Design an enzyme around this catalytic site. Structure first.
Site, PDB file in Angstrom:
ATOM      1  N   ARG B  15      19.547  53.173  10.267  1.00  0.00           N
ATOM      2  CA  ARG B  15      19.854  54.595  10.082  1.00  0.00           C
ATOM      3  C   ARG B  15      19.630  55.085   8.642  1.00  0.00           C
ATOM      4  O   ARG B  15      19.893  56.247   8.334  1.00  0.00           O
ATOM      5  CB  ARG B  15      21.281  54.893  10.553  1.00  0.00           C
ATOM      6  CG  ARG B  15      21.437  54.784  12.070  1.00  0.00           C
ATOM      7  CD  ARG B  15      22.874  54.716  12.551  1.00  0.00           C
ATOM      8  NE  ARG B  15      23.522  53.455  12.186  1.00  0.00           N
ATOM      9  CZ  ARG B  15      24.839  53.241  12.189  1.00  0.00           C
ATOM     10  NH1 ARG B  15      25.689  54.203  12.539  1.00  0.00           N
ATOM     11  NH2 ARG B  15      25.311  52.050  11.839  1.00  0.00           N
ATOM     12  N   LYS B  22      19.293  47.019   4.475  1.00  0.00           N
ATOM     13  CA  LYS B  22      20.463  47.871   4.257  1.00  0.00           C
ATOM     14  C   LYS B  22      21.068  47.806   2.852  1.00  0.00           C
ATOM     15  O   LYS B  22      21.385  48.839   2.264  1.00  0.00           O
ATOM     16  CB  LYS B  22      21.545  47.525   5.282  1.00  0.00           C
ATOM     17  CG  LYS B  22      22.640  48.568   5.411  1.00  0.00           C
ATOM     18  CD  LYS B  22      23.599  48.200   6.527  1.00  0.00           C
ATOM     19  CE  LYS B  22      24.589  49.312   6.776  1.00  0.00           C
ATOM     20  NZ  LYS B  22      25.479  49.040   7.937  1.00  0.00           N
ATOM     21  N   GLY B  78      27.235  38.276  15.078  1.00  0.00           N
ATOM     22  CA  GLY B  78      28.582  38.710  14.742  1.00  0.00           C
ATOM     23  C   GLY B  78      29.013  38.197  13.383  1.00  0.00           C
ATOM     24  O   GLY B  78      28.420  37.257  12.858  1.00  0.00           O
ATOM     25  N   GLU B 151      42.597  46.759  18.964  1.00  0.00           N
ATOM     26  CA  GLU B 151      41.474  47.691  18.939  1.00  0.00           C
ATOM     27  C   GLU B 151      41.837  49.001  19.650  1.00  0.00           C
ATOM     28  O   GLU B 151      42.851  49.083  20.348  1.00  0.00           O
ATOM     29  CB  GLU B 151      40.227  47.065  19.579  1.00  0.00           C
ATOM     30  CG  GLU B 151      39.776  45.735  18.972  1.00  0.00           C
ATOM     31  CD  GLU B 151      39.401  45.827  17.500  1.00  0.00           C
ATOM     32  OE1 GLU B 151      38.728  46.803  17.105  1.00  0.00           O
ATOM     33  OE2 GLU B 151      39.769  44.906  16.732  1.00  0.00           O
ATOM     34  N   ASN B 166      42.197  47.610  10.054  1.00  0.00           N
ATOM     35  CA  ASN B 166      41.521  46.416   9.560  1.00  0.00           C
ATOM     36  C   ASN B 166      40.221  46.792   8.857  1.00  0.00           C
ATOM     37  O   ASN B 166      39.470  47.628   9.354  1.00  0.00           O
ATOM     38  CB  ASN B 166      41.229  45.482  10.742  1.00  0.00           C
ATOM     39  CG  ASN B 166      40.425  44.262  10.345  1.00  0.00           C
ATOM     40  OD1 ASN B 166      40.673  43.651   9.312  1.00  0.00           O
ATOM     41  ND2 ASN B 166      39.462  43.894  11.181  1.00  0.00           N
ATOM     42  N   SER B 402      -1.033  70.459 -40.845  1.00  0.00           N
ATOM     43  CA  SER B 402      -1.027  70.775 -39.421  1.00  0.00           C
ATOM     44  C   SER B 402      -2.380  70.581 -38.743  1.00  0.00           C
ATOM     45  O   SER B 402      -3.422  70.798 -39.350  1.00  0.00           O
ATOM     46  CB  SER B 402      -0.563  72.217 -39.223  1.00  0.00           C
ATOM     47  OG  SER B 402       0.779  72.353 -39.645  1.00  0.00           O
TER      48      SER B 402
END
Ligand SMILES: [Co+2]
Ligand SMILES: [Co+2]
Lengths: 450, 450, 450
Positions: B15, B22, B78, B151, B166, B402
């Site tokens: 995303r 990421k 996981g 949950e 959590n 100059s």
């Protein structure tokens, strides 16, 4: 009745971590204490007694022209002691308002309400409602008068829920101040003479104390460090921007606008994001200022567009002129109507006449330029290696070719034409064309790397 | 006892809509994962196990010098599976803290409290109170220990009102991690091995889990997309600015200030709006930085003023120098004390000696310039059309007129004077005046259009 | 069924303090009324009836190309009277949505929900929940339909606590509008014909009025002054920035980003703080824009970096080019791939070929430059003092030495080499080296002040 003010301004301001004393740190380009002095003056104060101490020499140099009574306090023994330093100068029958030099946002309007609410021989106390009033003295009202200011550690359960608290700002007559200040003691944990105790002393004398609530919480907010000062700055700038928006100035983003002085404006003025206005600036009708511009002490005529990233100081710009982007006007720049100044151009102490253009990569200094001139890209006014510098005078309808140096002192008369790459040291007459004769070597068959 | 960290950093970050993985997206100029590595190191971590996967080659190139154990995960199954990839390297009697590479704002101070709260053979779990805790696992406390993480879809009515949730950040000893990770299953709707289940397994073993609340909600906040990342950036910049303000740096608007590296500062430093500080920057006492400036890897001495829209990189500036506005210092620019660099001037890989001025429309590159020189407007150092470029050496007390070109390699000795419009190819001796003899044609009666 | 819109746009907008009428003031570079017209068009409106009056000539010039029915109202007698001006053009069996030209943030998505909720022969009314609904008409719902809109001074105690209020935006069929508008009276304190009364008239006819709540409060917010307009601007810019962030554009600070037009972008685009995007801008993959840049009507290829304080308009930039800092591209600038444009460089109506560099203090105008050219510092294209200006044509692999003037019309062929300080008026041939022969006077023992 008459009015005088006392401003408490003696603090070291240790948590600013500065060589300056507390109240000299600026908000909107102006020392905090200067905001308070100005407010006291517009309130109609006859005398302003400035209690000062720490950083005394810096206070005196930074505020030399302020119309105040300089009251040099030798030691900080509490707010009542500070106010009492000015007490000998109080007229018995004038009102006295006590203000703090580290609380610059207090408004004339709130202080006018405070003075008006003051009962005869009594006190008007400025209060403020906080959502979390922990640490501050709670205002106790029996009927409609302040009978006590109960500090945090003395308050019972229900008194801690009171949101109204003491600010320390108050108004009373001069005779009452002289009387009560002499009766303030220092029997407390800090060993200080607190101005707060005047409320107790007034109630002892059967004199009325009336509370006047401040409209905005930020109004009475002080600054003990630079984080708090930054919060005051942002509040102040937002208030200024909001005032200008309601007056009809289009400010694209009021959170990205800074005014550090005064702005007079016409109608249909547009100011893009990240513009800083400093000193006294006047903008005419339909002036458009692009993003990133800085204007300090300038007057800009009607219908002028200043394009992005232009920096102007001590300059005047006539109507319908076009400046920028990346233009720099230094002090003494005076551009006439319908002029054009472009990118990477610097103009210093010079006048430029109507319709003239100076559009690229150019320095014009100590010069007078007439009307309808064409100053080419790369043109530079310069001087000999001498003592003082001198002036370049260009008349009307002059063409100066690109990358030409004009070596002052020199005069170029009306209608003259100068070729590119020229070094002008001698005066040029009316309708004189000056072109440089170059010598070049031409080498055929010169092969560059392959 | 000792400590090591595990950082989860394997995600694709879909995303973000990026070719980067990421955790390589930057906050304050530094990849998110680099923030977490640094925090782990200052916490005292002996080993830092970096679990990586997606964009592996980019991770390795962008973090090549980081002192981490590179643990390449072949599949995301996981968080428990990810931590278990590093488990073989855990010492039995060191603590292990689990951190997330997409949550860069976690502080050393919070993690120190977390580690200290960990009971022997138990877990310390970092929690956070949210006003709307919908979707997150609720912390259930029986007496003073976490007995469950319930949950969203399992919670009863009263459990959904629990605000504490959590974060997934936790500390336990290495032996306990090895034991419990091997007992985590994947019998849930997602089919994943969740690190969260260690709390249940600890309670199964009659081991204590203690909750430690995070002070700030943003501290434990992650970024799944660039909108969330922008929110972390702004929080981070505001914290940095607030720290500097409390240290005594005057930042006019902390919402328009960016630090992307480190800043050492003296006292009474003033930084105007829209300044960016990058890399390692050191500012002396009483340095003033005007609006729009960008400083990257610079050292600035006491009492230097940098005026608006100046860009400096890899440069040193001596005390009492004045730079800007519209000045550009490129890498290797070394300005001595009391120097002056002005608008539309570019200085690259050059030293400029005490008191010298370079104030308009000039390029100085690969040069040495002595003390008290006057480099005129329009002066340019250049090279022949050859191979490598070469150096221009200017001594002390030299005047360069100059619009002069200095053609390297060339040497101009002390006290020399060069007229405007000159092309210098040959060395100039001590006290040598060089002036260009121009040929001009003058045509009288040249009438410009009328 | 079909749809047409009516837009109310006749107001003077007195509190804007402007010579413009109310709805011509811009949001994101576009008049407020233009936002509403565009939304009506994307909704699928067949006709858009624009009720105008004050500043009529300005409306006609500023919106000349808008596909609307110009309905000139001679007097403002209330919103029902305004809508009735367009009523003769309503088709009996099309829907009509009533919109306000000073409420530019209304979305197509909300209006689609409104139209869909409209029952046959009935009205769909757009409402909004306010925390303080004081002053606005409260929505009274009996079962699931709006039976009344009770104004502030008519409401009883419990009705004042209703947060849902009337916005005045509604949808009904054309025949119903014709019928009910003819039955609106002006018997009220203001003496005006209110469109609001259609709800009462619908309920009189046993026709259903359904409420549709707006998602965002700011969506239905109008602007009566420039402070309110500034609030709409900031909301709009934040929504635009948030959309771009979620699409994968890295915007360092979305509060310091402005889009005033359209932006097409690739992946991994990075936009630093204080960038303004105007008109139609297209950015390729991995484009980086530094702080302070302004891009108006530009196309930028893949892998281009634009460094700080660059201003580009009506220009094209090829892949892998490097622009800035302090670069200015004016209309007609076309830079090829792998080009380099540097500080204090201005390019106008010129093409620059692949690999060419123009890195300092240079003006290139009305020019064609080939591939792999080296345009030295201080180079300027210029013209004779004549009528129209002319073109400079430079071929491939040309070296132009520093501080050279190219005097158009002139042609420099492939492989040519030009020395520094040259004035080029004559065409230069292929592999021709042109060097200026300078005459200098050298004076030994010239002592500068001591
Ligand atoms: Co020259
Ligand atoms: Co030049």
């Amino acid at each position: 009745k008459a009015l005088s003010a006392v401003i408490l301004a003696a603090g070291k301001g240790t948590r600013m971590y500065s060589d300056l004393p507390k109240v000299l740190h600026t908000i909107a380009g102006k020392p905090m204490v200067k905001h308070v002095i100005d407010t006291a003056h517009q309130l109609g104060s006859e005398n302003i007694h400035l209690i000062y101490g720490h950083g005394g020499d810096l206070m005196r140099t930074h505020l030399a022209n302020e119309q105040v009574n300089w009251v040099l306090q030798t030691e900080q023994l509490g707010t009542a002691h500070a106010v009492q330093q000015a007490a000998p100068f109080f007229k018995d029958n004038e009102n006295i308002v006590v203000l703090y030099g580290d609380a610059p946002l207090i408004t004339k309007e709130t202080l006018e309400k405070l003075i008006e609410a003051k009962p005869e021989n009594g006190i008007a106390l400025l209060t403020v409602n906080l959502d979390n009033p922990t640490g501050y003295g709670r205002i106790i009202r029996e009927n409609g008068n302040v009978v006590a200011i109960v500090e945090q550690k003395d308050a019972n359960a229900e008194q801690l829920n009171i949101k109204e608290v003491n600010t320390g700002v108050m108004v009373s007559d001069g005779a009452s101040f002289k009387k009560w200040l002499a009766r303030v003691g220092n029997n407390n944990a800090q060993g200080e003479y607190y101005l707060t105790d005047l409320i107790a002393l007034a109630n002892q004398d059967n004199c009325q104390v009336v509370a006047v609530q401040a409209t905005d919480v930020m109004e009475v907010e002080g600054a003990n460090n630079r984080l708090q000062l930054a919060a005051l700055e942002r509040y102040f700038q937002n208030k200024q921007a909001s005032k200008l928006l309601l007056e009809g100035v289009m400010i694209y983003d009021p959170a990205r606008f800074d005014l550090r002085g005064t702005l007079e404006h016409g109608k249909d003025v547009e100011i893009d994001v990240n513009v800083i206005i400093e000193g006294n600036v006047k903008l005419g009708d339909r002036v458009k200022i692009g993003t990133g511009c800085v204007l300090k002490n300038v007057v800009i005529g009607n219908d002028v567009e200043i394009k992005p990233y232009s920096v102007l100081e001590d300059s005047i710009v006539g109507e319908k002129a076009a400046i920028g982007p990346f233009s720099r006007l230094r002090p003494g720049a005076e551009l006439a109507a319908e002029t054009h100044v472009g990118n990477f151009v610097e103009i210093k102490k010079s006048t430029v006449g109507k319709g003239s253009k100076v559009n690229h990569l150019t320095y014009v200094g100590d010069s007078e330029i007439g009307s309808n001139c064409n100053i080419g890209a790369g043109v530079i006014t310069c001087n000999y290696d001498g003592a003082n510098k001198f002036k370049t005078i260009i008349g009307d309808d002059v063409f100066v070719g690109s990358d030409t140096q004009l070596v002052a002192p020199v005069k170029v008369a009306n209608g003259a034409t100068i070729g590119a790459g020229t070094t002008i040291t001698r005066d040029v007459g009316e309708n004189e064309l000056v072109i440089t004769r170059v010598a070049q070597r031409h080498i055929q068959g010169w092969q560059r790397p392959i």
